[PDB]
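#struct-pred
JK: can someone run the complex with flavin-adenine dinucleotide? inputs below
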Amino acid sequence: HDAQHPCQANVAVRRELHTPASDRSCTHLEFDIAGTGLTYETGDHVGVYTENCPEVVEEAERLLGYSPDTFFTIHSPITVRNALARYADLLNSPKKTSLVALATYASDPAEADRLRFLASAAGKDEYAQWVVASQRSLLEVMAEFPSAKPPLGVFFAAVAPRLQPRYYSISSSPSMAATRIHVTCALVHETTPAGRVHKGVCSTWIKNAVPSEESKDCSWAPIFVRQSNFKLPADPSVPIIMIGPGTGLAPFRGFLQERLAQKESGAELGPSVFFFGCRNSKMDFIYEDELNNFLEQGALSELVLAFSRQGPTKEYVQHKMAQKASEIWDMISQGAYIYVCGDAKGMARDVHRVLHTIVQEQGSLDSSKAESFVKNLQMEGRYLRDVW
Ligand SMILES: Cc1cc2nc3c(=O)[nH]c(=O)nc-3n(C[C@H](O)[C@H](O)[C@H](O)COP(=O)(O)OP(=O)(O)OC[C@H]3O[C@@H](n4cnc5c(N)ncnc54)[C@H](O)[C@@H]3O)c2cc1C
Ligand SMILES: NC(=O)c1ccc[n+]([C@@H]2O[C@H](COP(=O)([O-])OP(=O)(O)OC[C@H]3O[C@@H](n4cnc5c(N)ncnc54)[C@H](OP(=O)(O)O)[C@@H]3O)[C@@H](O)[C@H]2O)c1
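RT: done, structure tokens with the ligand placed:
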């Protein structure tokens, strides 16, 4: 019932979205909010509190040397083991103030000197490479310096920051489902430059959550809702363009549920065009069936697709945007809103760059005018991005 403070909501359904032939995974999850004061609007975000994997917690317990059977008041009582699971960010990289604190408690002079060094101005380049670039966890830094043994209070006050909640762009509309909060969540699983195997904290928890639809002893999590400006226009007559691939599809599923929801009790839809992208029609084409239904009805006018690993061609959403550069510019002159959701470092940037180019050819403006023009779709509120 608060952004800072969560509501114990349960997991009703949890399903894999990829096919058994997919090499990756994407979970569809539904939070049951019946009887909770939680309310949400299309395009809003849901924050989720999660916990650490037990192996990671155990490595911390090894390193810290506490009795897990100690109870204590995190600034009502809790055990060391549960505090590490739910309140300690163990896997991100220690800030410099956290290294300072470890050094204070490092009984090896050389280890204590190295910790203090990495936190000093003199050590900034080294910190950037050995800690940040390599994505070394608090648990690794601590193993590198085993004489650093901070007391329980310091550890939670200065060494480990709290385990932040993870945000997901809600993928359902309240009209279609006012009792369920829908999330679409890619399983994260990387290897750091230093070679640590990292399981995404919240995306692994979601992947393995037990839903009430398969057992009574079901999973639950403290959730909460964050209002966003990623909202549909006032009236359906306004034409809209939705661009996100992969999990960038999430908000638009709510968008299409909302169009349809209004559509049953309302006016004709404006043209809807959705650019989707994924690896293979037979692997990660999440929500395929639902999308064709949205087409059979009037929810979405059209669904361009981009498959980047299936077939000879590496097709991306922006590549499918340039081919359709004529129709979308017409959409702009008709007053269309444009939505971009998904990966922020590559796709959004690439899509942003493509957008600037399309106006030049289909608008006859120079680079500066195009830039100012696009900047002005943003200010007007017609160009929206939900990226991460
Ligand atoms: C507004 C918003 C909406 C979102 N919507 C969605 C959505 O709809 N679907 C979805 O799947 N996700 C979404 N995300 C992203 C999501 O919130 C999480 O970031 C993502 O799921 C990973 O969560 P995780 O806890 O599992 O991974 P984490 O455990 O947080 O890991 C995150 C990344 O950090 C890397 N990492 C590991 N160790 C280190 C280190 N020491 N230093 C630096 N980096 C390290 C990992 O390799 C990994 O790539 C959204 C994010 C935002 C902000
Ligand atoms: N390499 C990266 O830096 C990168 C990019 C995106 C996501 N991720 C990670 O992978 C996980 C799943 O994310 P997701 O499901 O949204 O991503 P995804 O499934 O990897 O991406 C879906 C589609 O987006 C395509 N794509 C990749 N780069 C693109 C670009 N620059 N422009 C346009 N399209 C592009 C992918 O192509 P290909 O995959 O065939 O290249 C794929 O076809 C996330 O946890 C995320 O952190 C990593």
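RT: quick notes.
The radius of gyration is 24 Å.
The chain is about 35% helix and 20% strand.
JK: thanks, will look after standup
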